[PDB]
């Protein structure tokens, strides 16, 4: 994968406006669980599923997140578009992060419309006590996450589309590109003439559109790309 890593580094080093697009592949290491109809039928199932999933996710940022943060610090990466709700990009130091599917940070009771910060629930949550509305007692505390069957936040989606339309490099990391409308974004960048890079553990059905394809672990690949970019810029 070294020649591919070098090709990706060359693209990024020459770019005027690079964008990174991430999915669950960088964070890890259906209807009833993660959809709005599922949540309305049984919000406890969503929360019990989330308790199981938390154990499978990285508790803190990994080297892929730090590499992406460093590329922004270097002035290369202008935006991170993410499908993830775990805020690991921000915790790694990324600033320009577009959260297509929101995040767990803020929550609302669907019955009485009370608002919450995640900090209010996290202790109980880690003990397996599901979020309940303290005001009215409801089981319907919904995080400001886009569940399947919900539209995306309009401002965020617009900004992400604008990034895709006006970038000259677009790097997908840890996404199979099967969730829409998020998955439209790499096609928009491709149509706009951006150089297309993909980094994944496995192939995707979208692989044919990419100029550079890297199969590997993002935590290994992304730091190597950064080091090569620094070498091309005489920073290492």
């Amino acid at each position: 994968m070294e020649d591919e890593i070098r090709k990706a580094a060359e693209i990024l080093a020459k770019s005027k406006h690079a964008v990174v697009f991430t999915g669950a592949g960088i964070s890890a290491e259906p209807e009833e669980v993660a959809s709005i109809s599922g949540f309305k039928r049984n919000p406890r199932a969503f929360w019990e599923f989330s308790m199981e999933m938390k154990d499978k996710l990285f508790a803190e940022p990994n080297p892929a997140h730090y590499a992406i943060a460093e590329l922004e610090r270097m002035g290369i990466v202008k935006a991170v578009i993410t499908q993830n709700i775990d805020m690991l990009h921000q915790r790694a130091g990324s600033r320009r992060v577009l959260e297509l599917h929101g995040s767990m940070d803020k929550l609302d009771c669907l019955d009485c419309h009370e608002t919450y910060d995640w900090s209010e629930f996290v202790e109980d949550f880690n003990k397996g006590e599901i979020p309940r509305c303290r005001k009215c007692g409801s089981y319907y505390v919904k995080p400001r996450v886009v569940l399947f069957g919900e539209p995306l936040p309009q401002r965020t989606l617009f900004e992400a589309i604008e990034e895709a339309k006006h970038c000259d490099a677009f790097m997908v990391v840890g996404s199979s590109l099967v969730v829409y409308p998020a998955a439209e974004l790499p096609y928009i960048a491709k149509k706009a003439g951006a150089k297309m890079i993909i980094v994944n553990a496995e192939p995707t059905m979208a692989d044919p559109i990419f100029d550079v394809k890297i199969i590997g672990k993002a935590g290994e690949v992304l730091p190597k790309i950064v080091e090569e970019v620094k070498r091309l810029r005489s920073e290492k």
């Binding site: 069957g149 919900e150 969730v179």
Partner: peptide, 10 residues
């Protein structure tokens, strides 16, 4: 507005 968050094969 992009429709709903949804799964497709590609």
């Amino acid at each position: 507005k992009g429709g709903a968050k949804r799964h497709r094969k590609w």
